[PDB]
Symmetry: D2
Subunit: 251 residues, 4 copies
């Protein structure tokens, strides 16, 4: 009866809010994680406590490598294994850190992590998702509203997010004859990085015209839920910016 | 106590579907109209039958002129007179016809109607709305195909691009008042009444998702989302509702 | 046999530099002006001193009104009257001032900001096309229109509209071999009434060299677009902004 | 005192025209190539017969791999070894082929080739170029004007080109303090695929408003020349579309 959603990097933060909101809307959910095993299991527990057999976890590294296609296949397989179907895919998992052009991680590792999580893994997941569907089927990609006014020294990350815009459009066109919609949600400033100091957090928050506040995880989730809902049945290839006006502010 | 909305060009088609959906959501509505007096009054009547005195009509030419500022002030006024508040403005009214560059409205009428309805009136409405001012927002009806325009529709396209500009500029400026400003960009929706059946079929068949134009209710859906509590962080955004049409190459 | 260009608002600043650079390239030029009669005449003088009979002035208000179509037609006529042809149009003239949402009447703001930045370019385009080699139009856009200054909504509306005209006219005039393109400055020559400390604020924002573009730098891009080196380019807008539009809040 | 340029994939077609035109402008050139050895040496020969000691060849696979960073550093090194300097990088080399989302290269190979050539290698070349400069320095990336209205089934290619737009912007921002400009040139339809039949070629030619024909390689090179010239001293982070109005034509 109930549709089933896969959410990547769903253990914490925005991806958790999305998994929660999908669950509250009646979805069964695959909680994908990489390092956050305890959080993922804890979330799956809460959801199962609310409804029996409605949440499973699935562990996978989404770094680019020659086995990434098999890992992605396996994420989609774990949703069919648990729930017998897979209606929604949310590409939320993301690596995010600077990669300066001028000088622990080798550059090969930087490439693999930032391009793999942000772009190639969404692409292989999309292929695996579609191959299983070869109903209200959709994919939502977590993009970035600030990619055209990027932070200094974030070239690879920005390349990955721009690539994900490219995938959003190319997959929307190609999957439309199957009824599969493909769209994006582009946060500006949301939950700030765990490592960022309170003072820097404050600087970022106050750049936002609408209320001088970061978007809550729930606010982002609200846009995701809109895109997968019957209220968006004609929307595909669209990216909804959710940024409180941040991208409109000049230097 | 219920919120109130103005919807321009609300007598028929997309504007009517927005008005109805806002009304169904619990809004009181001003149905603005220009020539479609029977349809406008009839719609308001049906809404009032559903809930007493929850709909008013207001007629106004949104052609650019030295009287346009007052007319736009009067529309916003009408909402405050009827309902004592104005929470939502939907700039939906729009002129749409060819204005070839190389050669019976005079070109100055074409200018006044296409730039007035699509851009200047939204601007003056936005001014009046903001001037009079806890979930306030403006939704501008844009056009997903503005970067791949139909041949000979320069003034129309100029208007819709100006409307994108307005959405962004007004989002920035009005954010300190809590007024969100967003847009909804249809691709092909209800086709022009004038358009021949063959041309209509040529458009719908180009749409990747379903080979069908959007229903008026599908557009209204996105408007509803933008005015809703589910979009409280969204401002300066334009949501394309086009079934993937703008993605299709020549 | 020398081709001819119209440049609107060519008496001073960027338009002056564009008229001068086109002239140095070998064009005969119509120097359009509104209030700057003395400056326009000096320029025509300097240019004709270099090559006899190669520059004329043409006065016109480019405020929106029911006669704007005729004034625009007259600017193109002035090129044909002087030079017997019109090869290039540069839409440069522009009103720029704030128009907050919350002693010019709003209707005057609309007419000046939308007429100069958009409607007059449209009507000049129609007149240019109606008269019709390396034919092209260049529109002076704005690189910052998606991250606009506070309180400039009419100006931004005009500049967005001009992008739309650039694309629509490029599409419609291509079958005539007329190319239509844009040049989008960021910070260039700073507004005459700006204080030095404020100028300096805008300079420090520019990644490439922490300075504004010279007028000549803007003119360089125009020159490119009108040249035989840009023969396949139409519907393009070149940003000339030193990376300003890439800088976040 | 003659400046020097690297052009990738410069043996044939557009990259060849770029190399020729830079040389004609007075640059010394490194002609990078992958498989087209005969064409590359043949071009080096012509250029040298015009001015001695002004053209060399450099062979490298630009496929993504853990060896790609070394290969890229080596290409830039080639220009220092031969010419003592490196003023201009043009990232022209590109793989281009369909990658259906729904089903004889493996998916891993398709990723490596399409994301490597179109994005990763440009990023790594850009690091190596920049590291050396830590005068009129600039990079030109060959983009694609049709990236927002993409051909069916070219997901990875489009991801690659979108990433390359991201690079262009990120790198323009990050390298501006060194005086290095970073810009792009976005052909529409230019030299048609060698493997495309004359009937399909004419189909594409007919779509182009400006003259109903593809751009010549020389027309594309013209734009690169402008961007590298002193006529573009203030231009960085810009992409010039060279497409004859193609991207303006609706479905
Ligand atoms: N937060 C913000 O301000 C903004 C967010 N966004 C986008 O929104 C989305 C959610 O953001 P946010 O919640 O902050 O994301 P996080 O930075 O918290 O990343 C979410 C999850 O991604 C997973 N992940 C990271 N690297 C890998 C990897 N190599 N393989 C597998 N999974 C991996 C992690 O899983 P685990 O912990 O289990 O290892 C992590 O918890 C992202 O796509 C992001 O780029 C865009 C703009 C701003
Ligand atoms: N339909 C579609 O496929 C598409 C629609 N859109 C946009 O969506 C919105 C709604 O579309 P749609 O329902 O088709 O619009 P219509 O063409 O039906 O126009 C809506 C209303 O605008 C009003 N209007 C026209 N001229 C004037 C004027 N001078 N003064 C005042 N009002 C005027 C009319 O009121 P009255 O009838 O009372 O005179 C008309 O009913 C518009 O902004 C449109 O551009 C965008 C892309 C495609
Ligand atoms: N300067 C900058 O930093 C930037 C410039 N731009 C764009 O580049 C172009 C040139 O900028 P800039 O040189 O500073 O321009 P100016 O503000 O100096 O204006 C150029 C000319 O426009 C003419 N003009 C103004 N109003 C009217 C009118 N109603 N009718 C006719 N002509 C009129 C004036 O002519 P007169 O003096 O004869 O009355 C004026 O000299 C403009 O399009 C501008 O928007 C874009 C971004 C930044
Ligand atoms: N032609 C057109 O119509 C259009 C072109 N463009 C862009 O313009 C640029 C030039 O186009 P075009 O000349 O047609 O390009 P080609 O398709 O002819 O490819 C250029 C060169 O790329 C090199 N290349 C391909 N794969 C690899 C690899 N794995 N490692 C190293 N080098 C490799 C090849 O070198 P070799 O032959 O030595 O093996 C090839 O000759 C490209 O970036 C392209 O995407 C954009 C839009 C349309
Ligand atoms: N945590 C992430 N995966 N992505 C992320 N985190 C981000 C934080 C900010 Cl301040 C911005 Cl402008 C963009 C960001 N993207
Ligand atoms: N009816 C209007 N006012 N606007 C409108 N009507 C439109 C019809 C189409 Cl076929 C497209 Cl492409 C854009 C349109 N915009
Ligand atoms: N003077 C004009 N006509 N236009 C103009 N002048 C401008 C000055 C700035 Cl500092 C920016 Cl950001 C945009 C501008 N546009
Ligand atoms: N050959 C390449 N490497 N790239 C390339 N070749 C192309 C050919 C076309 Cl007719 C299009 Cl619309 C885009 C192209 N991109």
């Amino acid at each position: 009866e109930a549709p089933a959603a896969v959410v990547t990097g769903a253990a914490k933060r925005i991806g958790r809010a999305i998994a929660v909101k999908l669950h509250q809307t009646g979805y069964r959910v695959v909680i994908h994680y990489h390092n956050s095993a305890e959080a993922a299991v804890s979330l799956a527990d809460e959801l199962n406590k609310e409804r029996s057999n409605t949440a499973v976890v699935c562990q996978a590294d989404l770094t680019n490598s020659n086995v990434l296609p098999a890992s992605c296949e396996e994420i989609i397989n774990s949703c069919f294994r648990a729930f017998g179907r897979c209606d929604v895919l949310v590409n939320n998992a993301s690596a995010f850190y600077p990669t300066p052009l001028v000088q622990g991680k080798t550059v090969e590792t930087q490439v693999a992590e930032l391009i793999g999580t942000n772009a190639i893994a969404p692409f292989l997941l999309t292929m695996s998702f579609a191959q299983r569907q070869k109903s209200n089927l959709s994919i939502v990609n977590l993009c970035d509203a600030m990619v055209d006014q990027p932070c200094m020294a974030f070239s690879l990350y920005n390349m990955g997010k721009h690539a994900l815009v490219g995938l959003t459009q190319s997959a929307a066109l190609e999957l439309a004859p199957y009824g599969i919609r493909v769209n994006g949600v582009a946060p500006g400033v949301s939950l700030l990085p765990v490592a960022m100091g309170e003072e820097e957090k404050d600087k970022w928050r106050r750049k936002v015209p609408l209320g001088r506040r970061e978007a809550s995880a729930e606010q982002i989730a609200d846009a995701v839920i809109f895109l997968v809902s019957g209220s968006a049945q004609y929307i595909t290839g669209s990216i909804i910016k959710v940024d409180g006006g941040l991208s409109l502010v000049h230097a």
